[PDB]
Amino acid sequence: PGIVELPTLEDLKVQEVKVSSSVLKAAAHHYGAQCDKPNKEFMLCRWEEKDPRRCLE
Amino acid sequence: ASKVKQDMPPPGGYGPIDYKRNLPRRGLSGYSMFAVGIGTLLFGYWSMMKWNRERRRLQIEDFEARIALMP
C-alpha cells in the first residue's frame, strides 16, 4: 500500500561532530547555553512533524 | 630421738578462702543507653539529609547536561 519515500545518501551527508562523550559532557552546559536557538528549532520541528525526513535541514 | 614430722596445716591456720558468688554490676542505666542510641540516630539522620539533598542537586546537574546534549 505505497512506497516508503527515503532521502538520498547525499541528503544525509553532514560534517560530523567527532568528539567523544566525555568531551561533549565537559562542554554540555556552555553548549546548551550558546547553541540553544537552532537546537530548540530542531526539537520543535521533530516533535511537531513526527517524521525525521521533514527535519533534516 | 626424732620428733614427729607430718603434713599439717601451718600454726594458726590457712588464710581465708572465698566461696560466695561474685557477679558485679558493671553497667550503665537504661536511660543513658537509650539516650546515646537516639542521639546517634539523630546525628545520622541530619548528616544523611544534607548528603542526599546535595546528591539531588548533583543529579539535576547531570540531567541538565544530558538535556543540553540531546538534540
Automatic annotation (TrEMBL), chain A:
Superkingdom to which the source organism belongs: Eukaryota
Disulfide bonds: 45-55
Subcellular localization, as worded in the UniProt entry: Mitochondrion intermembrane space
Family statement: Belongs to the complex I NDUFA8 subunit family.
Subunit comment: Complex I is composed of 45 different subunits.
Annotated function: Accessory subunit of the mitochondrial membrane respiratory chain NADH dehydrogenase (Complex I), that is believed not to be involved in catalysis. Complex I functions in the transfer of electrons from NADH to the respiratory chain. The immediate electron acceptor for the enzyme is believed to be ubiquinone.
Protein name: NADH dehydrogenase [ubiquinone] 1 alpha subcomplex subunit 8
Organism in which the protein naturally occurs: Sus scrofa
Span covered, complete protein: 79 to 135 of 249
UniProtKB/TrEMBL annotation, chain B:
Top-rank lineage group of the source organism: Eukaryota
Cellular localization per UniProt: Mitochondrion inner membrane
Ranges that cross the membrane: 28-48
Quaternary structure note: Complex I is composed of 45 different subunits. Interacts with CARD15, but not with CARD4. Interacts with STAT3, but not with STAT1, STAT2 and STAT5A. Interacts with OLFM4.
Its job: Complex I functions in the transfer of electrons from NADH to the respiratory chain. Accessory subunit of the mitochondrial membrane respiratory chain NADH dehydrogenase (Complex I), that is believed not to be involved in catalysis.
Family that this chain belongs to: Belongs to the complex I NDUFA13 subunit family.
Name this protein carries in UniProt: NADH dehydrogenase [ubiquinone] 1 alpha subcomplex subunit 13
Organism: Sus scrofa (Pig)
Shown part of the complete sequence: 3 to 73 of 144
